[PDB]
């Protein structure tokens, strides 16, 4: 038959591309399988083209060669890149027509009941580019494109040829060729998902399990969980790196290379190798989309008082409301407090606790030296990306630093303010939900600009006020002993205090530099001299 008798889906070793292969089989091979009588009754024509594209290392070449193997017909012809160009005039067309001459001859000799011929073009963009938009040094490229267009669909009709083309930049291809009759079906290959990442990891480990060379402590599901945004090539590279790390432990190089050969017949791969490789060898080519929450939360969170729990509960309530509402697709909230209170860390924690698919943080740390237009463009891009997902959450921190505010005159950038005021009231497309969390340290200034009314609610973040809270914080950090704690309490318990947690940490670190007989005193002075505040 036209299909190899032994062919089956499982044998080609493809990963998680179930839908795409099914679509190809539906839209490309349905007609050739039905009996000639009914297809003749419909009198419909047959597809002749396919255009695969996507990011590098997804499986395009693998899919093409597997399709070639699946079909029982003449050995596929392969055009390896720009091998068809020649210096002599008129010889490129000679090759481009020699490719199709055999199929033309067979179709002439047998007619409608002839076999099928398959031709594979690799790096099509190298050959075929827009005729008008091209170098003027030589018209060779235009003649080549015209010859290909004439041969594929000319006055003479040929109907027993299938052409496969793979590329990476589909835009450059000429429009005249991507029309029905030449290449109508156009797929897009993308990064796999967790299930695809599990299937891919399974396809390679098979032999090691078969020969009992893999330790039982390895959990493939966990590995698939950690490896986010990876591709098939990167997964295979990770496997190879773990294998090499395991193998390296039986060679004594660096003076002269030797192998044990008697302690080297009991080799096995543990989970430690995979963990080591995942941090040293392989990094995802596609930049990790997960935010680096460690940078924003550098010392965790400690429950030194009720306000922390109150703020977290309010954030959870807001998240629930935005998740389970339909009359109000857009919600906003503002966190305000005195400096050195830990607003950014709390906002980051609130964002993390939610499980929304899309989460991003916009900070001025990246916009150094930028003009007042670059900032607007960056914010627009971030919000455009957020609009795509069904549920989105965005965090804007250090608003006053984002407007370039200075109290002398005063001065600020108007364009950014207007853009923000417009983006705080633009609802997303139908059937989508968005949440915005803003952070600031000067509420009166925002009140003056008349943007405090643009938000929906406000949350207050206080700083340490009573000596008991200070003692609790010291206990949680545990940087002083009981004697020193009693000494400090004897003084602090009498009155009240006013200090932020970050400044408290800085003061502790500065104090610990003195000799043991002085540290406590060094601490007290620093609290007394700087502690003058309401």
């Amino acid at each position: 038959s036209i299909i190899n008798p032994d062919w089956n889906f499982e044998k080609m070793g493809i990963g998680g591309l179930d839908k795409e292969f099914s679509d190809i089989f539906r839209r490309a091979f349905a007609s050739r399988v039905f009996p000639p009588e009914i297809v003749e009754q419909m009198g419909c024509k047959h597809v002749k083209g396919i255009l695969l594209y996507g990011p590098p290392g997804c499986g395009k070449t693998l899919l093409a060669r597997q399709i070639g193997k699946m079909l029982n017909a003449r050995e596929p012809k392969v055009v390896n890149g720009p091998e068809i160009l020649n210096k002599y005039v008129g010889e490129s067309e000679a090759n481009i027509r020699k490719l199709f001459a055999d199929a033309e001859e067979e179709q002439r000799r047998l007619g409608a009941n002839s076999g099928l011929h398959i031709i594979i073009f690799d790096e099509i963009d190298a050959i075929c580019k827009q005729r008008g938009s091209m170098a003027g040094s030589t018209g060779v490229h235009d003649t080549v494109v015209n010859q290909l267009l004439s041969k594929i669909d000319g006055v003479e009709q040929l109907n027993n040829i299938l052409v496969i083309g793979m590329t990476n930049r589909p835009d450059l291809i000429d429009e005249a060729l991507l029309r029905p009759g030449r290449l109508e079906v156009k797929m897009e290959i993308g990064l796999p998902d967790e299930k695809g990442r599990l299937q891919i990891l399974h396809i390679h480990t098979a032999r090691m399990r078969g020969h009992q060379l893999l330790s039982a402590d390895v959990d493939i599901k966990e590995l698939a969980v950690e490896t986010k945004n990876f591709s098939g090539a990167e997964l295979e590279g990770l496997v190879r790196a773990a294998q090499s790390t395991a193998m390296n432990r039986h060679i004594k190089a660096s003076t002269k290379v030797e192998v044990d050969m008697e302690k080297a017949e009991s080799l096995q791969v543990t989970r430690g190798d995979f963990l080591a490789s995942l941090e040293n060898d392989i990094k995802p080519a596609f930049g990790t989309n997960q935010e680096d929450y460690a940078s924003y939360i550098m010392n965790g969170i400690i429950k030194w008082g009720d306000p922390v729990t109150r703020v977290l509960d309010d954030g959870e309530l807001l998240v629930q409301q935005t998740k389970n509402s339909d009359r109000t697709p857009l919600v906003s909230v503002l966190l305000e407090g005195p400096p050195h209170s830990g607003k950014t860390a709390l906002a980051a924690k609130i964002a993390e606790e939610s499980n929304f698919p899309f989460i991003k943080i916009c900070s001025p740390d990246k916009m150094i030296g930028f003009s007042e237009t670059a900032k607007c463009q960056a914010m627009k891009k971030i919000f455009d990306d957020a609009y795509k997902s069904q549920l989105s959450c965005v965090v804007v921190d250090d608003i006053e630093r984002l407007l370039d505010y200075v109290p002398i005159g005063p001065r600020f950038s108007n364009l950014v303010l207007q853009a923000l005021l417009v983006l705080l009231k633009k609802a997303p497309p139908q059937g989508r939900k968005l949440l915005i969390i803003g952070t600031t340290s000067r509420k009166d200034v925002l009140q003056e600009m008349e943007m405090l009314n643009a938000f929906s609610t406000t949350i207050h973040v206080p700083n340490i006020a009573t000596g008991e809270q200070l003692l609790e914080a010291l206990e949680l950090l545990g940087n002083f002993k009981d004697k020193e704690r009693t000494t400090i309490a004897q003084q602090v318990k009498g009155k009240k205090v006013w200090i932020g947690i970050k400044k408290l940490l800085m003061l502790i670190e500065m104090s610990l530099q003195m000799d043991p007989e002085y540290r406590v005193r060094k601490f007290l002075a620093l609290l007394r001299e700087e502690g003058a505040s309401p």
């Binding site: 210096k87 002599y88 030589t138």
Partner: peptide, 16 residues
């Protein structure tokens, strides 16, 4: 307006 810079060239050989 700055005049366009210089350009390279490509050559084609013919056989008699």
């Amino acid at each position: 307006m700055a005049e366009d810079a210089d350009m390279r060239n490509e050559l084609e050989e013919m056989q008699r």
